[PDB]
Amino acid sequence: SELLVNTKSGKVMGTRVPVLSSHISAFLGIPFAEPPVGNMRFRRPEPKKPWSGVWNASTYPNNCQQYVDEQFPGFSGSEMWNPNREMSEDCLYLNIWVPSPRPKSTTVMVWIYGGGFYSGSSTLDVYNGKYLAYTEEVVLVSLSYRVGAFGFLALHGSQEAPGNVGLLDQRMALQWVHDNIQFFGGDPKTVTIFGESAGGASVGMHILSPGSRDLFRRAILQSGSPNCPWASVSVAEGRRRAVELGRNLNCNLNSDEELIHCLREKKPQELIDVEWNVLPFDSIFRFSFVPVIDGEFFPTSLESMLNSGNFKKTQILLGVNKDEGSFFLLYGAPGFSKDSESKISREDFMSGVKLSVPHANDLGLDAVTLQYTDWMDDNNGIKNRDGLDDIVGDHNVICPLMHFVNKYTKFGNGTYLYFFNHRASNLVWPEWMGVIHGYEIEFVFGLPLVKELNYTAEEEALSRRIMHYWATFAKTGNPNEPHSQESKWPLFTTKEQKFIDLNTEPMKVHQRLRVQMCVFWNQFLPKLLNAT
Amino acid sequence: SELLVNTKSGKVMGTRVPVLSSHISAFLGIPFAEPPVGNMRFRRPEPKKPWSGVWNASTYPNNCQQYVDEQFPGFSGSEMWNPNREMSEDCLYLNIWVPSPRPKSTTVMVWIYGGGFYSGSSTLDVYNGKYLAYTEEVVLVSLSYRVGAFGFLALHGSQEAPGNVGLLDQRMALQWVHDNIQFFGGDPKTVTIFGESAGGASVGMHILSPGSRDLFRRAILQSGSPNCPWASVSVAEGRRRAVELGRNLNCNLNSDEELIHCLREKKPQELIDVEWNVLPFDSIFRFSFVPVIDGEFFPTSLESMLNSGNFKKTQILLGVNKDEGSFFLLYGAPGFSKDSESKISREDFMSGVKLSVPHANDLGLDAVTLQYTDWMDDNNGIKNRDGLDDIVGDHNVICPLMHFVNKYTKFGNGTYLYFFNHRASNLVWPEWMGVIHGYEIEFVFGLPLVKELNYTAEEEALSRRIMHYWATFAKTGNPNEPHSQESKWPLFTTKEQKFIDLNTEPMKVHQRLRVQMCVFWNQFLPKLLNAT
């Protein structure tokens, strides 16, 4: 049977699913690890024990325990990101979409969801891999991993809560793909991992980590890189946050053993209800439990690794969205509202700057403010609103990714950069937010090909181009068709630094993506904060 | 006789001079102080003793001893600024141009020449006051003052070389005008002092100094303000430079008495030959002997004086030229040449930045460089050349004047600001230098009205407008004609900060002259250097 697959862990039974008037196979909820529950909470994952009989993989698995956004009850804009399945600590499963008839050895794409390392689900409607699997004829895999304290609580030095276990979940899933995807028609030597935001940072982290490098061929990073200011913390800060968490739940803090044991006795929701209280600063775009530079998963600091070429050398495709920061300002910055134009005053502008660069001293705050203020029109509400939007995006997403790409490209075997600047015609979020963080995902997974979702003809065409770029890159290491007559996506080189825009207009190639600001965020500001 | 005038110091005999096919009276070389020679070198000036008989004021006086530019031998561009009379320490004289028939009580304008406090002459062809006196019917006075070590050697604490004596020469000349201009037809209660560069800084200094304020009515400052980074030094730096000067001439340095006595035995040219060796830094736009914040001429720091309104409150007219810095780069920055386009490399750009802001630490140099670099086109020779030109002008002239105007306007009775951006059609300097430091002077003194000098018809018209603005301002405190139909020069206010351009095109009003850069130079950079 096409729906029956015998893997090294046991037999699995998939289900046939309709897609654009055709069909493909889907294997949902395949376990790749032992449920990290009880005494296993906070521990590195263990391989799923082989099973006898047939594993029923016809329905989505549970979603990992996580904070749930309730800022806009009922609103599709935000609820489309919330878990759509029951939450459970028993959540380490993966999903596979296989073309029909089943391929023999086709290209594999493994999706790693984002969510600031504190949320995310592989089961969201925007992550339905059936469209991409069907249209590009690839085996599409989406994995899952522990988030929040459950996946990143870090008490370095102890083996009970070492940290980075969420990244180890991802690695274990990749290990399963490497060992079993051949039975689903996939080519284990041609796997491309791709992800957005924290998922993009994760992909970059696997490129860096010695223990993950051999598990994939190529990589795609969307709006996220390993060196992002929010993506990781020191073992010291990790420890500090772990202890403060214990303090919020009145835990015994005399020893790690004491703290960990006390935390393992708490229901999931108890840790989640106080998770946000451990941040060191009043801030925006900063998350509590994230990866930690431990000396194991990450041999040394990320900067020294990027500088010495200590990372997997292969081809990479990556880029950002035009307005990465609007989402975080809407939720946490004074003056921003979902139902108004959010024109910002001088007062709230500087209030926002302080929130966006929490680690900055006064001189630093002044530098940022001067860098993004038009003094010939300083009380212009729209300029202050957009200036703040740019700050959040440049500091947290764009400039860090540009630092990564420039450092990587010196040792890599091929880089392709994009700038996604098309605002979907059916977006429910306000106009002032622009091309929002995460809204390029729907074009990557091809939702515009489904009429009932209400996209325009040009948006469907844009989705097919993007899906074809991603899949062709995954297959060949180059997004372009060898002998195509279409416009060519130039290779980003250390010298030219070319990139393309991604929208419904004829392809336009540019150079040095936001260089002016990136030099400020990557060279000047850090030097200023270190000297003063 | 129209050429005979009896003043409180004695009788003076002028001469009749032709001007634009007409004539006026000229009284040249009137002494206003005792010759500051011998034991008087470095001392405050003493009033000229009254004389019997008639003083022959028909020929220009000598020029004060000074460094003489020989960088371009024969070249009119530079030689038009060099002394055109024999140099002598006996040089404290003034010149007066009086309309014919002699007025009864007309507006007076006293010109104070510039020259970085190290040079300058009241006798240059560009300072011939006959045109302005004749055309606007005002009594035009040009004074002189000691420059270089002779006028600013400062050994605070001693009365033999206290410093600021050059400013006291100016004050003494103003005192003479106040006491005697009535005999030449001038109204002593309606005197406007005006000057360019160091002369503009001087005017601002008289506005600040309690002892000079009662000696004039209004003021005009051209490309210079008292708070310019090159216009003054601390008593400590003054002392240090005075001692280093003595060290270059092998003087006894055990006591001020020793040093001063040794310096008074030197010929003028001996001090001048080593004058430039005492600067503390390798620099551009920095002069050796300049005014010093002594606690007498200047009660306190200039900034505290500007902040507390401790200065003469009246009307002021001031402005700058488009390319104030090109002159200093041509002479002292690597990569610049008079006969080439001077396209600058990245290397020489940063070399130039270091020379332009000598007092800056590395972080500071980086801030400036980032502020003036277009990272999308960093190796563009023309952009680097112009960027450097802007740096020198903004830091040394424009931003300091904008700080002054904004501080002054809070307590003043009327401010008028201009931006001179017309490059004379007959300029001999290269095109890359643009609207050069000091080249608005010729339009102010009306040289374009003389055909033989080769200006265009529009430049003559521009000169008449400017002369009429200056003279009408001197007379009424407002450059505009009450019931004129002409375009109006708006008043600069704390709120609107309006200013006008000065060229051959229809008047255009603007706002916040170079605000972006001025906030960098007046608020951010100083804060950075103080914190780091």
Query: b/e map of A66-97 (b: 16 or more CB within 10 Å)?
Result: bbeeeeeeeeebbeebebebebebbbbbbbbb
Of the candidates B122, B197, B209, B342, the residue annotated as catalytic is: B197
With contacts defined as CB-CB under 8 Å, which chain A residues touch B523? 366, 370
Structure tokens at B293: 């914040």
> How far apart are the C-alpha atoms of A16 and A452, rounded to whole Å?
21
With beta carbons less than 8 A apart as the criterion, state whether B185 and B106 touch: yes
What region, left, alpha or beta, does residue A271 occupy, with left being phi > 0 and alpha being psi -120 to 50 degrees?
alpha
Question: At residue B117, what is the residue type?
Answer: F
> How far apart are the C-alpha atoms of A9 and A398, rounded to whole Å?
41
With beta carbons less than 8 A apart as the criterion, state whether B442 and B328 touch: no
- Contact: A511, B376; criterion CB under 8 Å: yes
> How far apart are the C-alpha atoms of A70 and B399, rounded to whole Å?
51
Structure tokens at B22: 């007409």
Distance from CA of A260 to the nearest CA of B (A): 43
Contacts 24+ apart (CB under 8 A), B348-353: B348/B384, B349/B373, B349/B384, B349/B387, B349/B388, B352/B284, B352/B388, B352/B391, B353/B388, B353/B391
With contacts defined as CB-CB under 8 Å, which chain A residues touch B527? 363, 366
With beta carbons less than 8 A apart as the criterion, state whether A259 and A271 touch: no
Q: Please list the alpha-helical segments (H only) found in B343-478.
A: 346-356, 362-371, 381-393, 399-409, 441-444, 457-476
Distance from CA of A341 to the nearest CA of B (A): 27
DSSP per-residue letters across B493-530? -TTT-EEEEESSSPP-EEESTTHHHHHIIIIIHHHHHH
With beta carbons less than 8 A apart as the criterion, state whether A425 and A455 touch: yes
SS (H, E, C) B42-91: CCCCCECCCCCCEEECCCCCCECCCCCCCCCCCCHHHHCCCCCCCECCCC
> How far apart are the C-alpha atoms of B466 and B502, rounded to whole Å?
8
Please, is A338 exposed, middle or buried when counting C-beta atoms within 10 Å of its C-beta (0-12, 13-18, 19+)?
Answer: middle
Annotated catalytic, A324? yes
Residues 6+ positions from A420 with CB-CB distance below 8 Å: A319, A320, A321, A322, A435, A440, A443, A501, A502, A503
A186 DSSP β-pair partners: A106
With beta carbons less than 8 A apart as the criterion, state whether B210 and B125 touch: no
Structure tokens at B157: 């604490």
**Closest CB to B370 among A375, A376, A520:** A520
Query: b/e map of B253-285 (b: 16 or more CB within 10 Å)?
Result: eeebeebbeebbebebeebbebbeebeeeebbb
With beta carbons less than 8 A apart as the criterion, state whether B344 and B392 touch: no
How many other C-beta atoms lie within 10 A of the C-beta of residue A213?
14
Residue of A333, A329, A346 lying closest to A393 (CA atoms): A329
**Closest CB to B524 among A366, A376, A524:** A366
> How far apart are the C-alpha atoms of B209 and B173, rounded to whole Å?
15
Tell me whether A532 touches chain B (CB under 8 Å): yes
Q: A316-321 and A218-222 as β-strands: parallel, antiparallel, unpaired? A: parallel
> How far apart are the C-alpha atoms of A413 and B43, rounded to whole Å?
76
- Start-to-end CA distance of chain A, whole Å, equals 68
In which element (H, E) is residue A501 found? strand A498-502
Structure tokens at A238: 């990790």
- Contact: A374, B516; criterion CB under 8 Å: yes
Q: For the CA atoms of A135, A139, A144, A145, what is the dihedral angle to 10 degrees?
A: -130
Question: At residue B183, what is the residue type?
Answer: F
With beta carbons less than 8 A apart as the criterion, state whether A61 and A123 touch: yes
Question: At residue B131, what is the residue type?
Answer: Y
Of the candidates A136, A160, A324, A459, the residue annotated as catalytic is: A324
**Closest CB to B366 among A370, A375, A527:** A527
With beta carbons less than 8 A apart as the criterion, state whether B470 and B109 touch: yes
Which site among B365, B371, B528 would you substitute to test the A interface, given the most A Cβ atoms closer than 10 Å to its Cβ? B528
Annotated catalytic, B58? no
With contacts defined as CB-CB under 8 Å, which chain B residues touch A376? 511-512, 515-516
**Closest CB to A512 among B375, B512, B524:** B375
* Torsion sign (Cα): A331, A337, A343, A349: negative
Backbone angles phi, psi at B305, to 5 degrees: -70, -45
Residues 6+ positions from B16 with CB-CB distance below 8 Å: B2, B3, B23, B24, B25, B26, B100
**Closest CB to A532 among B375, B515, B532:** B532
Tell me whether A304 touches chain B (CB under 8 Å): no
> How far apart are the C-alpha atoms of A486 and A479, rounded to whole Å?
12
Q: Measured at the alpha carbon of residue B440, what is the angle toward residues B458 and B298, in degrees to the nearest 5?
A: 155
Q: How many CB contacts within 8 angstroms connect chain A with chain B?
A: 51
**Closest CB to B519 among A370, A519, A527:** A370
> How far apart are the C-alpha atoms of A465 and A489, rounded to whole Å?
11
CATH dotted code for A1-532: 3.40.50.1820
Backbone angles phi, psi at A49, to 5 degrees: -70, 135
Number of helical H runs and strand E runs in chain B: 18, 16
Q: Please list the alpha-helical segments (H only) found in A321-448.
A: 326-332, 346-356, 362-371, 381-393, 399-409, 441-444
* Interface list for A 373-402 with B (CB within 8 A): 374-376
SS3 content of chain A, % helix, strand, coil (to 5): 40, 15, 45
B52 DSSP β-pair partners: none
SS3 of B321, please?
strand
- Contact: A524, B370; criterion CB under 8 Å: yes
Question: At residue A491, what is the residue type?
Answer: L
In which element (H, E) is residue B97 found? strand B93-98
> How far apart are the C-alpha atoms of A48 and A32, rounded to whole Å?
5
DSSP per-residue letters across B159-173? SSS-S-HHHHHHHHH
Q: At which residue do the structure tokens 């290491």 appear? A: A477
In which element (H, E) is residue A462 found? helix A457-476
SS3 of A338, please?
coil
Largest alpha-carbon pair distance within chain A? 73
> How far apart are the C-alpha atoms of B317 and B440, rounded to whole Å?
14
Residue B435 half-sphere exposure, CB side, CA atoms within 13 Å?
19
- Contact: B528, A528; criterion CB under 8 Å: yes
- Contact: B367, A524; criterion CB under 8 Å: yes
What region, left, alpha or beta, does residue A27 occupy, with left being phi > 0 and alpha being psi -120 to 50 degrees?
beta
CA A385 to chain centroid: 26
* Interface list for B 313-372 with A (CB within 8 A): 363, 366-367, 370
Of the candidates B89, B160, B324, B440, the residue annotated as catalytic is: B324
B25 DSSP β-pair partners: B16, B98
> How far apart are the C-alpha atoms of A95 and A85, rounded to whole Å?
14
- Contact: B519, A375; criterion CB under 8 Å: yes
DSSP per-residue letters across B302-317? HHHHHHHT-S--S-EE
What count of residues does chain B have? Answer: 532
With beta carbons less than 8 A apart as the criterion, state whether A507 and A466 touch: no
Tell me whether A531 touches chain B (CB under 8 Å): yes
Residue of B173, B185, B311, B290 lying closest to B231 (CA atoms): B290
DSSP per-residue letters across A250-290? T---S-HHHHHHHHHTS-HHHHHTTGGGG-SSS-SS--SS-
With contacts defined as CB-CB under 8 Å, which chain A residues touch B512? 375-376
Q: What would you report as the CA-atom Rg of chain B, rounded to the nearest whole angstrom? A: 22
The coordinates were experimentally obtained by: X-ray
* Torsion sign (Cα): A339, A342, A348, A354: positive
What region, left, alpha or beta, does residue A42 occupy, with left being phi > 0 and alpha being psi -120 to 50 degrees?
left
CA A438 to chain centroid: 9
- Contact: A367, B524; criterion CB under 8 Å: yes
With beta carbons less than 8 A apart as the criterion, state whether A222 and A401 touch: no
Q: At which residue do the structure tokens 């002997």 appear? A: B289
Which site among A371, A376, A525 would you substitute to test the B interface, given the most B Cβ atoms closer than 10 Å to its Cβ? A376
Tell me whether A86 touches chain B (CB under 8 Å): no
Of the candidates B437, B440, B442, B459, the residue annotated as catalytic is: B437
Q: Give the CA distances from residue A405 to residues A187, A207, A242, A498, in Å, rounded to whole numbers and listed in that order.
A: 27, 12, 32, 12
Of the candidates A342, A437, A459, A463, the residue annotated as catalytic is: A437
> How far apart are the C-alpha atoms of B132 and B372, rounded to whole Å?
40
With beta carbons less than 8 A apart as the criterion, state whether B182 and B322 touch: no
SS3 of B467, please?
helix
> How far apart are the C-alpha atoms of B144 and B92, rounded to whole Å?
6
With contacts defined as CB-CB under 8 Å, which chain B residues touch A367? 367, 524, 528
Residues 6+ positions from A314 with CB-CB distance below 8 Å: A207, A217, A218, A219, A412, A413, A414, A477
CA A399 to chain centroid: 16
Structure tokens at A73: 């009850």
Residue of B314, B29, B7, B410 lying closest to B176 (CA atoms): B7
With contacts defined as CB-CB under 8 Å, which chain A residues touch B532? 363, 528, 531-532
> How far apart are the C-alpha atoms of A57 and A30, rounded to whole Å?
6
What count of residues does chain A have? Answer: 532
How many other C-beta atoms lie within 10 A of the C-beta of residue A531?
15
Query: b/e map of A221-231 (b: 16 or more CB within 10 Å)?
Result: bbbbbbbbbbb
Q: Please list the alpha-helical segments (H only) found in B209-341.
A: 235-248, 256-264, 268-272, 302-308, 326-332
- Contact: A515, B376; criterion CB under 8 Å: yes
SS3 content of chain B, % helix, strand, coil (to 5): 40, 15, 45
- Contact: A370, B512; criterion CB under 8 Å: no
> How far apart are the C-alpha atoms of A49 and A340, rounded to whole Å?
53
Structure tokens at B354: 């270091």
- Contact: A376, B532; criterion CB under 8 Å: no
**Closest CB to A376 among B366, B515, B523:** B515
SS3 of B13, please?
strand
In which element (H, E) is residue B141 found? strand B139-142
Residue ranges per structural domain of chain A: 1-532
Q: A186-196 and B4-7 as β-strands: parallel, antiparallel, unpaired? A: unpaired
Q: What is the DSSP letter of A480?
A: S
